[PDB]
Amino acid sequence: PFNGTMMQYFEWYLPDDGTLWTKVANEANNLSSLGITALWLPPAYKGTSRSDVGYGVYDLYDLGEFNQKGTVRTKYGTKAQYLQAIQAAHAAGMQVYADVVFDHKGGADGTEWVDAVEVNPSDRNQEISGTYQIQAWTKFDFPGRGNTYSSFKWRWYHFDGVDWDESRKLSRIYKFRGIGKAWDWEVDTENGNYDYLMYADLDMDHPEVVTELKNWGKWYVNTTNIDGFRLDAVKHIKFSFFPDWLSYVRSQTGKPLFTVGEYWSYDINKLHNYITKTNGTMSLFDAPLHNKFYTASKSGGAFDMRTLMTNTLMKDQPTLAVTFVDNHDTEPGQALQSWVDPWFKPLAYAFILTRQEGYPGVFYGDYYGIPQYNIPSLKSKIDPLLIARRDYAYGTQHDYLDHSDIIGWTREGVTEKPGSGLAALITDGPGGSKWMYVGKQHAGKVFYDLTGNRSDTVTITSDGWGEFKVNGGSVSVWVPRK
Numbered sequence: 001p002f003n004g005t006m007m008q009y010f011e012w013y014l015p016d017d018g019t020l021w022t023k024v025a026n027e028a029n030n031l032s033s034l035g036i037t038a039l040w041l042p043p044a045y046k047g048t049s050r051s052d053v054g055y056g057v058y059d060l061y062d063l064g065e066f067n068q069k070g071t072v073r074t075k076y077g078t079k080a081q082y083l084q085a086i087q088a089a090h091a092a093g094m095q096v097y098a099d100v101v102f103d104h105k106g107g108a109d110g111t112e113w114v115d116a117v118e119v120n121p122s123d124r125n126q127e128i129s130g131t132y133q134i135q136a137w138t139k140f141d142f143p144g145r146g147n148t149y150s151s152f153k154w155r156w157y158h159f160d161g162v163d164w165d166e167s168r169k170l171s172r173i174y175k176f177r178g179i180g181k182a183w184d185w186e187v188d189t190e191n192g193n194y195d196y197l198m199y200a201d202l203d204m205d206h207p208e209v210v211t212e213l214k215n216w217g218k219w220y221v222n223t224t225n226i227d228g229f230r231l232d233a234v235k236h237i238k239f240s241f242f243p244d245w246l247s248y249v250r251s252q253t254g255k256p257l258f259t260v261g262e263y264w265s266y267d268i269n270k271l272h273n274y275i276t277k278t279n280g281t282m283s284l285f286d287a288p289l290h291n292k293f294y295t296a297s298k299s300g301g302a303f304d305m306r307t308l309m310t311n312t313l314m315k316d317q318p319t320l321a322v323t324f325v326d327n328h329d330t331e332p333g334q335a336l337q338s339w340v341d342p343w344f345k346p347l348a349y350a351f352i353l354t355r356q357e358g359y360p361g362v363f364y365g366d367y368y369g370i371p372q373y374n375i376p377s378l379k380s381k382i383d384p385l386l387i388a389r390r391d392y393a394y395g396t397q398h399d400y401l402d403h404s405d406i407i408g409w410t411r412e413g414v415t416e417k418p419g420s421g422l423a424a425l426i427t428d429g430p431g432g433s434k435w436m437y438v439g440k441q442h443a444g445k446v447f448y449d450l451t452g453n454r455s456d457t458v459t460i461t462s463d464g465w466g467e468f469k470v471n472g473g474s475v476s477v478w479v480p481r482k
Ligand SMILES: C[C@H]1O[C@H](O[C@H]2[C@H](O)[C@@H](O)[C@@H](O[C@H]3[C@H](O)[C@@H](O)[C@@H](O)O[C@@H]3CO)O[C@@H]2CO)[C@H](O)[C@@H](O)[C@@H]1N[C@H]1C=C(CO)[C@@H](O)[C@H](O)[C@H]1O
Pocket: 001, 002, 003, 004, 005, 006, 037, 038, 093, 094, 095, 258, 283, 318, 319, 320, 358, 359
């Protein structure tokens, strides 16, 4: 038995110093000893510039190897350093998930003239202009790479649209004209059709494009030996595309390739729609649960903690849910900003780390800190919870989400891991106590608070129950002493 634990190993405001790949190589041992079993690494290919975080993808085939966009290395380092990081992660017994950005392409080498029409930004099925010629950033020739690995050249007809006309300096949503040219479907229905997002938007209906992304998928897994994918911005990408893409790349590389997609919506039914449409071929980030943590942390104690799990992927589809507290898009200043307050953050990590539903992740920004906004590191509060997950969070779970402030759950432990077992309490309000069942196999044992928030102890009764306790606005994780 084991508890998988992933770590997203970057944040937005990292300096553009080309050191992240080296840091993975240096830290892989430490993180593994804490029970981290997988790293989600940022996009490793060349962006619109060297300080691009990776989501403005210029060349999928340039892993910090070719002189392109004014730099050889990416933000994170060179191609050689990227490979060493992956091998170090493997030597320490960790999987590696690579960020995959297929929705769009930016930083084109040149413009092309294209017949286009404006569509309504709030309803992309509604044309709001006539057809006219625009100058669109869609020519990709890759002067620094040549035909190495791939001789495919991208042009306007491989895309469905852009949001910038270079001749008139106009910013509108332009749909391209052409035989069969249309926004892709199925996609998210916010704004009527949410296929267009930014830069030059890929046409997943074009067979040349499907083929090229399949060839890149195979090439990339074989070049890097990565173990899986984090799929960026999947709600803006033809739903049927990734079932077909993943089954090609998995079977043509001989690898299972665990895959988590980022479907950003707090509407659980949209996530359920996407899982059924893609036949459960991938996990998804539990964005609704993130929204729960953010809301509870801002509600001054008035959140009903009995609803913390309701309408989350961790409640509804736990084996396809990847759980988290914050990520690079929820950071201060970002477009999805909804930063979980530091007082509540240890409570949210305890919830995803010591419970049996879902595949939890630790955020780099939470672990190491975000100096850009003077947010201090929470490593000293997260590490006890990882040790809880590594050693104690095993076996039958009993739920007590039964009070509007104080909620808890227990894990009984497993014979295969002697000394396992835990009882966790969190509260968004004043402290208190709660009786919970850990199992009569623990009768007489003394439990202590692994987080060190409390100095007292709890003795288990002859019937397997303990009256566990928590401070106000705090976490306690009670585990057996030895
Ligand atoms: C390091 C670890 O890699 C493998 O485990 C990974 C799984 O193959 C993935 O599928 C994924 O599992 C998650 C599920 O997809 C998901 O539905 C959810 O329910 O949570 C799961 C994770 O909690 O991620 C896993 C890694 O995080 C591989 O199977 C495993 O063998 C590898 N490590 C084990 C190796 C040994 C066996 O002797 C022991 O050290 C431990 O049991 C494991 O650490």
